[PDB]
């Protein structure tokens, strides 16, 4: 939200990237919101790590769009940056600063999304390992 700055944050250090970039994580922007859903497939520049992040409630995304994100070398300082491209050819960069994470439960993360359009946007998000029922099954959306 306006005031948050992932740039001046501090990553968790003991973060093992491959325990995270593996599997499916569900991310809702609020208890209620269930639309739009959008599936993002992440690939870490290294050991593949085809992670499916199902994001829900983000008004900036279209409901029937898929994103293919590939890891880049940008933002070397304790930050994992990804360039995402979509079915509608949207494109934006997403940087993740991992704050706290239990690779099998949930993870608090500071995210900076930079759409080619209006750049700079920081928000503390929580990635869940368990689907909150109302969430679309990753298999359906991805």
């Amino acid at each position: 939200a306006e005031g948050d700055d992932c740039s001046i944050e501090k990553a968790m250090g003991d973060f093992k990237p491959e325990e995270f970039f593996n599997g499916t994580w569900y991310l809702a922007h609020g208890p209620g919101v269930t639309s739009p859903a959008v599936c993002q497939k992440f690939t870490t520049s290294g050991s593949k790590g085809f992670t499916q992040i199902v994001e829900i409630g983000y008004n900036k995304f279209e409901s029937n769009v898929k994103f293919q994100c590939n890891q880049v070398d940008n933002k070397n300082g304790e930050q994992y940056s990804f360039k995402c491209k979509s079915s509608d050819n949207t494109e934006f960069e997403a940087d993740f600063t991992f704050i706290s994470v239990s690779y099998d439960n949930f993870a608090l993360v500071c995210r900076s999304i930079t759409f080619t359009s209006q750049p700079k946007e920081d928000r503390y998000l929580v990635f869940e390992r368990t689907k909150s029922d109302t969430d679309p099954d990753a298999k359906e959306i991805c």
Binding site: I99, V101, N105, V126, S132
Partner: protein, 259 residues
């Protein structure tokens, strides 16, 4: 909590959880006093004997919870601290005297049905309610028993627990220990002669000891889970930080900006 029961959802919307960023681990309980101030015990942050010395950058507060290990999307809010204020006179070498800390959130949390501040005792409220015999309530995700045979898992609960304990007279509290009791603390629990029992235990150290006022129907925090010798031992009581006694100090660190 020893000898308590599962708390209903929303039982105490002021129950905050002190959580460590990495590794993820429940550190203590706390209490929401306003939308940007949370109260807890000093030893949850500063306690050299155990190597405890947390900073605003090591923790985060999870408010609105019910389950202890689970992230609850519909009710939980995660917040960060901007400042930690620990009492200058906090005595950790001796008896954990003035075991109190005040934490400031970076930005005010969003109140809801699951998040709401408890009242702080008044001069009249403390007077009419702090009487040996009257009960109070303690809530927490700490251990359900002092020990375990195989693993701590056996004693760790899944949801927030609730136990109601009566206030005990100071002379009894003083006669139960060979440790120095000070005015900044009070004890509660069942006397051995009463067919009941219950106590706070490891993992509950910041949670509020509250009492509901018969006069105005409001919940006041009278104490803070501080210490004891074991948990639920016969002839032993739990000692809570006398919140009302350190009321003037609280006001002193809160009101530090143009007022």
């Amino acid at each position: 909590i020893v000898e308590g029961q599962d708390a209903e959802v929303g039982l105490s919307p002021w129950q905050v959880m002190l959580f460590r960023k990495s590794p993820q681990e429940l550190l203590c309980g706390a209490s929401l006093i306003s939308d940007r101030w949370v109260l807890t015990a000093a030893h949850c942050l500063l306690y050299p004997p155990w190597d405890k010395n947390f900073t605003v950058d090591d923790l985060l507060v999870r408010i609105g919870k019910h389950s202890r290990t689970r992230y609850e999307r519909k009710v939980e809010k995660i917040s960060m601290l901007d400042k930690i204020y620990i009492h200058p006179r906090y005595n950790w070498k001796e008896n954990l005297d003035r075991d109190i800390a005040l934490l400031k959130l970076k930005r005010p949390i969003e109140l809801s049905d699951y998040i709401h501040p408890v009242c702080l005792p008044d001069k009249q409220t403390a007077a009419k309610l702090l009487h040996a015999g009257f009960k109070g309530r303690v809530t927490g995700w700490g251990n359900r028993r002092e020990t375990w045979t195989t693993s701590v898992a056996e004693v760790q609960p899944s949801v927030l627990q609730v136990v109601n304990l009566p206030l005990v007279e100071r002379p009894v509290c003083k006669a139960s220990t060979r440790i120095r009791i000070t005015d900044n603390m009070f004890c509660a629990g069942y006397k051995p002669g009463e067919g009941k029992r219950g106590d706070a235990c490891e993992g509950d150290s910041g949670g509020p000891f509250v009492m509901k006022s018969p006069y105005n129907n409001r919940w006041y925090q009278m104490g803070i889970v501080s210490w004891g010798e074991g948990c639920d031992r016969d002839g032993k009581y739990g000692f809570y930080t006398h919140v009302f006694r350190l009321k003037k100090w609280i006001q002193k660190v809160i009101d530090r900006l143009g007022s």
